[PDB]
Amino acid sequence: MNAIDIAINKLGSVSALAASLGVRQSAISNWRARGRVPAERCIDIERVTNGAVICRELRPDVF
Amino acid sequence: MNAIDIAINKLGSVSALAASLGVRQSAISNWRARGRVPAERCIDIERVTNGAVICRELRPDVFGA
Amino acid sequence: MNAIDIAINKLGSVSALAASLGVRQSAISNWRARGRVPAERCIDIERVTNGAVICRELRPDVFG
Amino acid sequence: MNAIDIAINKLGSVSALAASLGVRQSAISNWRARGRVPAERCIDIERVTNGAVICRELRPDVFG
Amino acid sequence: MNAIDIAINKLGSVSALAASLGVRQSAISNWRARGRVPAERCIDIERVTNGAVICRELRPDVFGA
Amino acid sequence: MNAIDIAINKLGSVSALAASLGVRQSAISNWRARGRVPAERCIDIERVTNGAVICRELRPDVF
Ligand SMILES: [Cl-]
Ligand SMILES: [Cl-]
């Protein structure tokens, strides 16, 4: 499963995830479309999802 | 503190660091100019420098404390 | 200490040298057990060691 | 070169390998003359060689 | 110069050095942390490293020049 | 014979040995009681005794 989708699963919605991270919903869409969450947002997603997804899942090329 | 410079000095030269990472010297020079190594190269740098620099020193905006 | 040994000291560890060459640590260990590095790795060793360990020291039979 | 020979190269000498295994140098020499190491020494050889010389290479009849 | 690190690198890893001396890895890590191998292990280290380090390098306060 | 006792034989007294080494008489007693001269004092004892006892006699586990 895609790591972003896991994060959406945990937050319950695109708007809730976006608000949780302080980013635009368009950002989350762009991340899903490009197949890349920004490296600098990985810890924040690991945090807001309470560990449902971790950094190495989001960006194995970085972590 | 300039983590990129510590890394260059650990290997001994920009050439040696570039070689150790499989990149062009110009890439290292660019990272240094902009003060930012690519996130996906931080572990590699930590490894080739034998831990003389660590990921959090290279990209504190990416790695945890 | 032989050429491999000093290449390792230069990089600081087997881990660091393996990473610098794009090989597994186990490959370095195998080279040490054989007593020599593959010819095809010598150029890269010379580069990543900042010239401290040169091709002709690694493989005199190849590089003279 | 066989497994014993490369274990010796890895450690650097018969002295160094004997010391690393807690055996007399004469024991190493005896193993070489027999053509194989005792099964009970294979785990330690694998360890002290940093994995370069593994049990199954030393004693295929035991370790496969 | 760090004689303990030269010894670790000669064997290839802390595990291999520990094995060669019949000690726990934690012992090697402790020696390194405190910058001092036990006097009674110096000859053993000199032997297992095939002389890549010698007793006087390990414990200059114990061995002669 | 005990190596420390040989050293005392050579220096002539506990105080002379202690002074020769720059240590407390209590140190020499402790060394005798514990059955261990400090490794870092072996060369000094070999020196002050002019070779009457040598390092390998004092600490065969070290030398
Ligand atoms: Cl032999
Ligand atoms: Cl190794």
CATH 1.10.260.40 for the F1-63 domain, yes or no: yes
Nearest to A49 by CA among A15, A2, A12: A12
Q: How far apart are CA E25 and CA E39, in angstroms?
A: 18
Cα distance from E23 to chain D (closest Cα, Å)?
A: 11
Q: How far apart are CA B39 and CA A59, in angstroms?
A: 10
Nearest by CB to B61, from A40, A59, A63: name it: A40
User: What is the Å distance from ligand 1's center to E10 Cα?
Assistant: 21
Nearest by CB to C5, from E5, E8, E52: name it: E52
**Burial call F26-41: b when 16+ CB within 10 Å, e when fewer:** ebbeebbeeeebbbeb
Q: How far apart are CA D18 and CA D29, in angstroms?
A: 10
B11 secondary structure, DSSP code: H
C61 Cβ contact list (under 8 Å, min separation 6): none
A43 Cβ contact list (under 8 Å, min separation 6): A55, B62, B63, B64
F1 secondary structure, DSSP code: -
- The number of angstroms, rounded, from the C-alpha of D64 to the middle of its chain's C-alpha atoms is 16
Q: How far apart are CA B50 and CA C20, in angstroms?
A: 10
Q: What's the helix, strand, coil split of chain D in %, to 5?
A: 70, 0, 30
Q: How far apart are CA A44 and CA A51, in angstroms?
A: 10
> D50, C29: Cβ pair inside 8 Å?
yes
User: What is the Å distance from ligand 1's center to D4 Cα?
Assistant: 10
Rg (CA), chain E: 10
Domain locations in chain A?
1-63
**Burial call A4-30: b when 16+ CB within 10 Å, e when fewer:** bebbbebbeebeebbebbebeeebbee
**Which chains sit next to D, with 3 or more Cβ pairs under 8 A?**
C, E
DSSP for A1-63, written as a single string: --HHHHHHHHHSSHHHHHHHHT--HHHHHHHHHHT---GGGHHHHHHHTTTSS-HHHH-TTT-
- Resolution of the experimentally solved model in angstroms: 1.4
Which of D20, D23, D54 to probe the E interface (max E CBs under 10 A)? D20
Report CA-CA distances (Å) from B59 to B7, B41, C24. Answer: 13, 10, 26
> C49, B16: Cβ pair inside 8 Å?
yes
Amino acid identity of residue A50, one-letter, is: N
Residue found under tokens 């990416």: B62
C16 Cβ contact list (under 8 Å, min separation 6): B47, B48, B49, B50
Q: Which residue of F has its CA nearest to E40?
A: F62
Report CA-CA distances (Å) from B55 to A40, B16, B39, B61. Answer: 12, 19, 9, 10
Cα distance from E11 to chain C (closest Cα, Å)?
A: 9
> E11, D48: Cβ pair inside 8 Å?
yes
CATH 1.10.260.40 for the B1-65 domain, yes or no: yes
E15 Cβ contact list (under 8 Å, min separation 6): D47, D50, E25
What's the CA dihedral at F63, D29, C3, B24 to 10 degrees? -120
Q: Helices E25-34 and E3-11: crossing angle, nearest 10°?
A: 150
Q: Which residue of B has its CA nearest to C12?
A: B50
∠ at Cα D46 (D42, D50), nearest 5°? 165
Q: Which fold has domain D1-64?
A: 434 Repressor (Amino-terminal Domain) (1.10.260)
C40 secondary structure, DSSP code: G
